[PDB]
Design a protein around this ligand. Sequence first.
Ligand SMILES: COc1cc2ncnc(Nc3cccc(O)c3)c2cc1OC
Length: 287
Amino acid sequence: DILPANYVVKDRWKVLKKIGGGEIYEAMDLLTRENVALKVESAQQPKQVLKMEVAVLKKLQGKDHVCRFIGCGRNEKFNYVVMQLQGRNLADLRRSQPRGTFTLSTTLRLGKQILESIEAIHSVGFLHRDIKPSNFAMGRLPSTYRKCYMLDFGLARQYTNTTGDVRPPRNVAGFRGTVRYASVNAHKNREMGRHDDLWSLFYMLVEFAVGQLPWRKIKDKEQVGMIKEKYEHRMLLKHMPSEFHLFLDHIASLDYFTKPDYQLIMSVFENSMKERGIAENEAFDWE
Ligand SMILES: COc1cc2ncnc(Nc3cccc(O)c3)c2cc1OC
């Protein structure tokens, strides 16, 4: 641990505990009195990622589904970022379910919220590249307990320049993220694009509603990729709503350069809800 418990950052943020490990801590804000999330990076670290995380978090201020930026700093021993602390993550909430599945109501409403977060990061010129259940968390306040938040920009990459031109893909781009929700393109070590974050959303939603993915037990990265490539994705949609074939067909047609049709995907969730009598004001499964 970079920071021991009770350490005070800039005479304001007192360390309570390590939440996930850079390193992420729950801290006490001695000025405002609320608890906050505090992420640190050792100043000696070769590849410096938190400077990029701060840039992403700063460009997203105003958009829904992002933590409020509180502060940041650099010092001789560490670099740090302070942000609004969230609550329960989607991976822990799903494993807490009696069958390890969410209802279609929860799944569809989480899908809408995550897609908005995905379109938001893409609208500021970044790819997330690590879309997975544990990188999304519900709020911890009366005003945020039904809002889903996008977390961890440690694997993000700018896909544009200053003029909004799509930057050239590299010939090979070594994939760094998690295996389970990675698209086939990511497994092939090809430059990831906006469609690859949408592929991850698709695998997440299948898992939420079904409780498992076919490659779940496989640990070897290469084996998972080979199963995914050969796997008939239509078979994943057996117990999923019918419109998801439009979601799957659309993302399968995209390439690195092509801007996705976020409204086509959003209609897929909105029409699946409407055709089942699902309302926005509905209670989530953990409630
Ligand atoms: C209570 O649990 C958590 C609460 C969190 N609250 C805020 N941000 C988080 N992570 C985050 C957000 C933005 C960028 C970044 O690098 C990391 C959190 C992570 C948690 O789990 C570790």
